[PDB]
Symmetry: D3
Subunit: 120 residues, 6 copies
Amino acid sequence: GVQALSAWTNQSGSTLYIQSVDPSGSLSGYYINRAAGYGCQNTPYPVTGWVYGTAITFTVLWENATESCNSITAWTGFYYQGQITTLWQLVINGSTSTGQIISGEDIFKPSQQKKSKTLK
Amino acid sequence: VQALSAWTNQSGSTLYIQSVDPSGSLSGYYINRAAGYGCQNTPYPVTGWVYGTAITFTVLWENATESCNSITAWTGFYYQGQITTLWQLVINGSTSTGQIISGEDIFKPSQQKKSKTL
Amino acid sequence: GVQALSAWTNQSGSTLYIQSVDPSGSLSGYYINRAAGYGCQNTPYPVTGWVYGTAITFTVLWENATESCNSITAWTGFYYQGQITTLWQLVINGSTSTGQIISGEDIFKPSQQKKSKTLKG
Amino acid sequence: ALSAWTNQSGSTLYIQSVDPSGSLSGYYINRAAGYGCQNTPYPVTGWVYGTAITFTVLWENATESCNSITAWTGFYYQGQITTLWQLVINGSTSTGQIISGEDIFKPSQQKKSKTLK
Amino acid sequence: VQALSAWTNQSGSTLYIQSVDPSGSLSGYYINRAAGYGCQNTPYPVTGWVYGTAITFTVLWENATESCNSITAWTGFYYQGQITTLWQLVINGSTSTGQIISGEDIFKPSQQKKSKTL
Amino acid sequence: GVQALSAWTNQSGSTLYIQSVDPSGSLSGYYINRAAGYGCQNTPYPVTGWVYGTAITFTVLWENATESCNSITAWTGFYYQGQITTLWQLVINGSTSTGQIISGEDIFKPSQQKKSKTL
């Protein structure tokens, strides 16, 4: 069951930061995109989602203070063998056909927290 | 796709959009009426995003009367009076992307019955 | 007694679905009215309120995008002897007098939660 | 949006937000003589639907709990909110323990300073 | 520093911490009672962060009864059962750091009081 | 000036990403620290605060799943002449003296949001 203060990096080096998970299962966090061929790289995008045991969904709105890519991604997946294995779907604002929804597979590995006693 | 809208799919399942925030954040609930899926006829919570005509929304299949140990995410777009969606359903305890169920839902808007009193 | 993911059905067949109770006591859930003659039947309405031990309040906005009945109900009650005993107050939009506010008593009995291992079955 | 409502006792309802769903959020200061939980802030939730309103206060905060909850039901009419309220105590056994009455709330005009000084 | 903890400073002002999330997110209210200040004896909203003994919280001096057109931010720490803080107060329309007001507040905890009834 | 979806970068290359400002003035966003000689660099941290015309406070909790620096910063400042001018205070968990609270001045300048039509 994926927990609050967790971070998950995919094969493209994109990271999901889970900042909270309610007892209700409601997930909150942010996402840095580092995938080649995708705009909206390097800056934080908001995340909402659900956790139910090892099942997870999470979706990112591709709009923030620095860059907007006029789109939304939803990942559906499961926690298994220390990684989140997901199928994702990307929809573009102004789409008119299902063929324009891009599909793919992301697998996320957990990062371990580097702890400093001070900002320095 | 604004606050206080409802959308019914080819199976007669309804998404109730309670609010859409300025930030795009979606809040609401969902009634499944699709044959061959459990968790029918009672409301499940929805979160998601709206960005113009693009929408994602996802349902946690646990409520006060029935839990089905799963989550559905819908990805799609509003166009020509309908939300065209692709959905993925994941079961708690899954070990393979082959256990994730996929389909397409077409959501048509409900027209409101307005009464002056309860 | 009153907790997250408990369902409560009154003498008329209406159901409060308590989804969540925060550590703060904040209640979120859903209401389906099934009360004979009343409008806005068999369609879910949002709920907010408070739980404090056996004390509960919860209020339903009778507006969703399918059916709207131009009103708000507030229930005030307590859990005791395996039931929630409530007094409710229903206000209609456009009211001009306290005399137009409708009141009654709802007794809510618990329903147990059904567990399935999948949505497929 | 941001608004303040004061009743016959000088109890003040502070509405901090109203969603487009009509969901109400804010806080409340009780000044009613005889109740405890006076003159400190308590959390508020409710609904607004046209001229109809409900709002309810949990009587627990960092300094004082009174082990109870109040729910107000009413309507906007001639620049005021006319309400019926019901108050339930935790541990109650009977509807006879549910205290009910009426409150009228007038809008509080916002006193603008340009400094905390 | 926890949910439903009350803190009163040398000037009689109280911090009412309503909630602290597992994340460290702080919500609550503030009543100012300090001589020489506007916006006294009505509740203002508080946000901030707790991280072990480290705390920040900040008050917008606007509610629908009295606004003072300013914001305070406290930075401090829980030490020997008290919170020691340095505060900065900024007024709307400021053009110099010299117009920001600074001081020190030491906040003492008050045990939460329990009445049987209301 | 200070609004939903405005980004603000200080003299050290640290960016405040304001995601939303409610009607009430409640600020929600993200921060990426890029300042030479600090921990918790190049990873986003959560922001809460208040906006009241040109007055702003915001505070960053130096904890995420990749890196924690056991501390919190609060910025107090005002938008003026295209810039947010701020004084900041940095408190480390387990401090025992106000002497241990570090301070400085940050000047944040805004970027124009870029619109890419495709991701």
